[PDB]
Amino acid sequence: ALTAEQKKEILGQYGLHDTDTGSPEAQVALLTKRIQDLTEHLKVHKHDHHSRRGLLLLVGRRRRLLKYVAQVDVARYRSLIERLGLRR
Template identity: 60%
Template sequence: MNSCFTEVFRSSSQGAGMIDKKAIIAEFGKNEADTGSPEVQIALLSSRISHLTEHLRQHKGDHHTRRGLMMLIGQRRRLLDYVKSNDVERYRSIIARLGIRR
């Protein structure tokens, strides 16, 4: 699991495994209401991807979730391509902060 997202998972029994979106938005957004910037969207997708990857390590036959994971990876890839085409420095920054290999 990505080290960037290990602290953002809730540990309560009701929301176990759920990501804390507010913490991710606070870390990657320009302000607390910034939920639409590509950096925030990429960070939220990355946390969901890492969570689903852990799920699939335990449940190897869950092909429905695997398809959803592949769709999330594609969506993140398109957002990263968009950021790269507009501002290479922002792209390099988000890749480094999230630890995504490219």
């Protein structure tokens, strides 16, 4: 999981300002970084179906948040997609 120092760092450079945390953009940033680290680990550990369940749950959360953002405001949604490299 992500610990204090880099979680604070990610909040800082990905949030609207240095105080808000519960922004959808902060949510997506945390989720994406965690999923990248975890996929790196799962490429080593293969049959951990117990944690790939959390994989799929986090992916569903990502997609749901992205749907919410694209429904609300498309400009910020697409800017975030481009600046984070996600396919959709």
